[PDB]
Amino acid sequence: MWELTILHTNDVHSRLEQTSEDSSKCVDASRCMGGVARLFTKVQQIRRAEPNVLLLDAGDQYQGTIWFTVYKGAEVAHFMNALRYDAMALGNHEFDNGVEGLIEPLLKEAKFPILSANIKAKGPLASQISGLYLPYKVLPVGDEVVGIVGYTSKETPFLSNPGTNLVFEDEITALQPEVDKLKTLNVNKIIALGHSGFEMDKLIAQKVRGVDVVVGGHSNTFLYTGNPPSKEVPAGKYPFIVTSDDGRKVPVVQAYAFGKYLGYLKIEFDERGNVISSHGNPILLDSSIPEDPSIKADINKWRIKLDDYSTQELGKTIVYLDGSSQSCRFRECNMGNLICDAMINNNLRHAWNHVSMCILNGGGIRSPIDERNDGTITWENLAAVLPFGGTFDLVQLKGSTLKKAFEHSVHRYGQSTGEFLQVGGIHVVYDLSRKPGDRVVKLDVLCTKCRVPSYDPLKMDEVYKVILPNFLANGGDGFQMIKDELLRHDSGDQDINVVSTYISKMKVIYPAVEGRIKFS
Amino acid sequence: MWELTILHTNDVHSRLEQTSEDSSKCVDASRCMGGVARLFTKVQQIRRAEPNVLLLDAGDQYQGTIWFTVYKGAEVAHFMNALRYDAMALGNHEFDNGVEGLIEPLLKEAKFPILSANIKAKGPLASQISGLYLPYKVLPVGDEVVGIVGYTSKETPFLSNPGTNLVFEDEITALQPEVDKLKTLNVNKIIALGHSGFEMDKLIAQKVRGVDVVVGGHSNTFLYTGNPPSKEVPAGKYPFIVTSDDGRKVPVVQAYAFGKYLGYLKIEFDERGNVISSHGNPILLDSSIPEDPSIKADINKWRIKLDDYSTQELGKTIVYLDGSSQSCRFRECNMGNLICDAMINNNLRHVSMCILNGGGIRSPIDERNDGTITWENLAAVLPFGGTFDLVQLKGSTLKKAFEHSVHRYGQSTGEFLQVGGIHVVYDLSRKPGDRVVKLDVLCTKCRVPSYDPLKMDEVYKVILPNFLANGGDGFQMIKDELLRHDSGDQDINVVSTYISKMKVIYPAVEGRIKFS
Ligand SMILES: O=P(O)(O)COC[C@H]1O[C@@H](n2ncc3c(NC4CCCC4)nc(Cl)nc32)[C@H](O)[C@@H]1O
Ligand SMILES: O=P(O)(O)COC[C@H]1O[C@@H](n2ncc3c(NC4CCCC4)nc(Cl)nc32)[C@H](O)[C@@H]1O
Ligand SMILES: [Ca+2]
Ligand SMILES: [Ca+2]
Ligand SMILES: [Zn+2]
Ligand SMILES: [Zn+2]
Ligand SMILES: [Zn+2]
Numbered sequence A: 001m002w003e004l005t006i007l008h009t010n011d012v013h014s015r016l017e018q019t020s021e022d023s024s025k026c027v028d029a030s031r032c033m034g035g036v037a038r039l040f041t042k043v044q045q046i047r048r049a050e051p052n053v054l055l056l057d058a059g060d061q062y063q064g065t066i067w068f069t070v071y072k073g074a075e076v077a078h079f080m081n082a083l084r085y086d087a088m089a090l091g092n093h094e095f096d097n098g099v100e101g102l103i104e105p106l107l108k109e110a111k112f113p114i115l116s117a118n119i120k121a122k123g124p125l126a127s128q129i130s131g132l133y134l135p136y137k138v139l140p141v142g143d144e145v146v147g148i149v150g151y152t153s154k155e156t157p158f159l160s161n162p163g164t165n166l167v168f169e170d171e172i173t174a175l176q177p178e179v180d181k182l183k184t185l186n187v188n189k190i191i192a193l194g195h196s197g198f199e200m201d202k203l204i205a206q207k208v209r210g211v212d213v214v215v216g217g218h219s220n221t222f223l224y225t226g227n228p229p230s231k232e233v234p235a236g237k238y239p240f241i242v243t244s245d246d247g248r249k250v251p252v253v254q255a256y257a258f259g260k261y262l263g264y265l266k267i268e269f270d271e272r273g274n275v276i277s278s279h280g281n282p283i284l285l286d287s288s289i290p291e292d293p294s295i296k297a298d299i300n301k302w303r304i305k306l307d308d309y310s311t312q313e314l315g316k317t318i319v320y321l322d323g324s325s326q327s328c329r330f331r332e333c334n335m336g337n338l339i340c341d342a343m344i345n346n347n348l349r350h351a352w353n354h355v356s357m358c359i360l361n362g363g364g365i366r367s368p369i370d371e372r373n374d375g376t377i378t379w380e381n382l383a384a385v386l387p388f389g390g391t392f393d394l395v396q397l398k399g400s401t402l403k404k405a406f407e408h409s410v411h412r413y414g415q416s417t418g419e420f421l422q423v424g425g426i427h428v429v430y431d432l433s434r435k436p437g438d439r440v441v442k443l444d445v446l447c448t449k450c451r452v453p454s455y456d457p458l459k460m461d462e463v464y465k466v467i468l469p470n471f472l473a474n475g476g477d478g479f480q481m482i483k484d485e486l487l488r489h490d491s492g493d494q495d496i497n498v499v500s501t502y503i504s505k506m507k508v509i510y511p512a513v514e515g516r517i518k519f520s
Numbered sequence B: 001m002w003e004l005t006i007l008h009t010n011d012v013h014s015r016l017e018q019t020s021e022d023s024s025k026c027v028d029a030s031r032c033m034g035g036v037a038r039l040f041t042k043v044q045q046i047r048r049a050e051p052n053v054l055l056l057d058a059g060d061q062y063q064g065t066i067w068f069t070v071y072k073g074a075e076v077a078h079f080m081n082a083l084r085y086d087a088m089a090l091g092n093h094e095f096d097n098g099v100e101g102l103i104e105p106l107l108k109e110a111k112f113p114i115l116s117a118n119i120k121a122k123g124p125l126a127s128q129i130s131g132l133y134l135p136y137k138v139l140p141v142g143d144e145v146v147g148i149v150g151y152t153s154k155e156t157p158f159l160s161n162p163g164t165n166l167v168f169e170d171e172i173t174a175l176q177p178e179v180d181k182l183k184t185l186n187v188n189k190i191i192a193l194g195h196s197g198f199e200m201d202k203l204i205a206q207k208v209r210g211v212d213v214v215v216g217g218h219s220n221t222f223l224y225t226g227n228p229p230s231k232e233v234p235a236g237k238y239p240f241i242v243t244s245d246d247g248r249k250v251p252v253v254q255a256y257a258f259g260k261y262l263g264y265l266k267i268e269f270d271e272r273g274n275v276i277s278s279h280g281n282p283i284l285l286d287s288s289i290p291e292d293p294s295i296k297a298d299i300n301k302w303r304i305k306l307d308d309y310s311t312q313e314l315g316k317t318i319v320y321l322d323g324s325s326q327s328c329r330f331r332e333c334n335m336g337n338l339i340c341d342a343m344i345n346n347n348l349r350h351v352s353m354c355i356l357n358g359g360g361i362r363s364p365i366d367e368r369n370d371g372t373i374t375w376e377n378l379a380a381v382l383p384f385g386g387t388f389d390l391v392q393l394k395g396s397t398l399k400k401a402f403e404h405s406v407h408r409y410g411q412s413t414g415e416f417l418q419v420g421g422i423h424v425v426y427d428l429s430r431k432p433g434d435r436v437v438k439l440d441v442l443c444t445k446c447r448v449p450s451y452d453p454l455k456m457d458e459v460y461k462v463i464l465p466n467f468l469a470n471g472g473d474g475f476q477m478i479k480d481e482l483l484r485h486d487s488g489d490q491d492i493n494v495v496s497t498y499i500s501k502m503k504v505i506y507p508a509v510e511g512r513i514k515f516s
């Protein structure tokens, strides 16, 4: 028997400092969780106790808070080096600043292998990015060797900016030849570390022969064995066991998101590299684990530059602004209503030209905002909600295109995918019992060609003026029908600026869940 | 036979100048209607053509626009004298400024009889007011005499400020002895002119023996025979014929409101004062009738005082603010939503709920004037000078208030509620007191406000006008069952504050009120 402890993080999303338990800015420090200084403490405590330890990242360190807006990846390279990560798989967000935004801040500065077997570079980019990322890495672990094969979501070109000189091959197709190569190199212990979501992770475990453990991200999947330590409801047991097609039991792990937890799985391997047993659970990074003084002091040095921002309050909230994914990707969430009202207000202020409707991919809502901080909302709080630097664009759509967009919003409902829409000037009702593509049972919209605006059934053959983020207007999130069927598209103001000017105009905000979205 | 032409107006409500067709401020003068200068022109044309003419007012000349806010009734006395009205019945709004606000500006200055048979004065007020108003007046009309008996709503002490020295008797009870007295005085032709609403008007016609014609107001009832000239949908034929208990056919007339129409009914009487036939229709006072130059010039002299109010724009509206009664007393109206949002905003800057008697919404606001909203526009919407008060109520009291809101739905009564932070659904097929089928309210004891079914045993913080908080509009359950009542800011100031903060407004009818 040979034992390995896999320590793992995924979807940290610029949460370098300890956060509130919902991962919003830390205010009451005694109840704060996560951060890199606290993570360093737990890792050290496990490394001290266990002989064979790997610390892995399943991607999406990039994009999330003012840490990234300012350091653009340099903070990721620096503090992951400080923590001595053994390997990292590339996430879709690592491409948000293009290949140059990945190469210079992270690929050239990381002292640990960065992996992806399903990303192939072509032509001009190929010679530049040579060995800057790898398909796998064979890591010495004590008297053994462990192979770690990387993978990144197929939909990265539709979620990010990877550019035209990167070919995103199907995960399973690209993984099997890499795993088979490692077997010929007599690497009997194989970890698939990647960023495609829990459903693809279970598929890789099932189909890719020779993979022993799948470590994933992207779906922000919380898995737990027994009674959970916080507010996250588990999606299944930890580890999640997949019975593979070749007749093996393959554990699948994920550690939620935002560095709130440290994934922890102890594996017993046999002489031949097969998993005999696996047990563990994600470790809640709460107050009972102290922040490392050395890392903390270094975080405070790097914080001086973020503090240069105005601590000026854009306004106050008397209600909790629910910007969490388990709300905004599943049902009507008051943060979505606020952003849609900000969108409509911005466009109706300077204007046919009359815009009453708003759509907004819930997945584009990246953080909640707490109201107990005397209700204060600053640019830093807002930048965690809207970090992508997009614009709120004006589009002209047929009712049939909008009916299609709303069918797409729920086409794969239940997987925590980002396409679920938050709305303004629309009253939609879904019936999830119905087959995908026929789930919209009611779709009323606010009339424009009326002196008194009211909700009327959406007409297939009619034309509507919709305010939506540029991401959607450009057919992002699988909304092909918008880019292909739109009749007019006009660029709008910057997303964060639209919301901050609205908050400033309102002074005190109180958005509610009021029935814009219903389920029968 | 002897023919009489009854010309009549009711519920003019300070509409001294010509207005828009919805009775809001006149902007595009070429499409404007009503006003006293135009009314004077039609009256004059009828008077030259017909030998026997009476011009009557069925009350509610008072309260409505900045004309009243400034002139406090003096403008009513002056321009009704100019038009040479033959008689006027007292409306509930004639008491809005108390008895002193009725005595000095109007009663002492009117050159025509002011009537009410069901209002009895007691003690100190009695000796002051003697003969300033009368129960009836016998008017010479050619070689004949016509008796006009007046009446005022029983509900005046609960709608206005008449004071404690005025006893408002039931209309029918007070009318019959007065009509009977006139019969002994050999007055064979009797008109009941009053202000209690169409339903009481039909009742008076039916029960008060000897009344030949009922001229009314208060319900803003539009009656028409044939195809109507404007946007008002008739409530019945003109005149409305009631078969009285003594067997006779009694015509009932009303001329909508705001001086948009002039009521016009020709009556053929027999030598014994019995109506043989009656025919007519309200005359639309549109652009095809010129404003009288003399009255118009005099309106312009009286307008210099109002003009002193700075036309500073509080904000802009990109939508029509529907503040009409046929909307706000029947269903969810975007003006009600705006005022309720202004109410909630004022108090939240935790109170999530708002109720607002639709009858307290007195005018719409047009958006085609480049969207401009001034204090003058707002003063026509909120003319009563009330406050938006904080109240603490049990869910059962609120369920009662919502049952009262629709208890007599269909009569254009003011109690129908406009709401904020409430989602109500009614089923009018159901018996009164059991019409509320859904009542969800915005939670307070929650971090994220959502709509939850109203709990009978729970306590709620509601923002409502002082009028309602003090059990007005028949909302006895509020004054009697409330747990806490706190005075709020002045109604017009709350809304103007809000409009100024929002700059551009766009309220919508969004489903706060539904009908099953
Ligand atoms: O965040 P993970 O990859 O861990 C999982 O969630 C993914 C979801 O987030 C949403 N999303 N993704 C990217 C993206 C975006 N695009 C700019 C331009 C290129 C990158 C940023 N802008 C907006 Cl408005 N929302 C975005 C979207 O709803 C997606 O399904
Ligand atoms: O106007 P008319 O008499 O022709 C017919 O409509 C009557 C309706 O109007 C409403 N109403 N009446 C009076 C009144 C008010 N009271 C102040 C104190 C004393 C006078 C003004 N304040 C408010 Cl918020 N609304 C009021 C109420 O909804 C009533 O049913
Ligand atoms: Ca193996
Ligand atoms: Ca008679
Ligand atoms: Zn992520
Ligand atoms: Zn991702
Ligand atoms: Zn009236």
Ligand SMILES: [Zn+2]
Pocket: B060, B091, B092, B093, B195, B217, B218
């Ligand atoms: Zn009245």
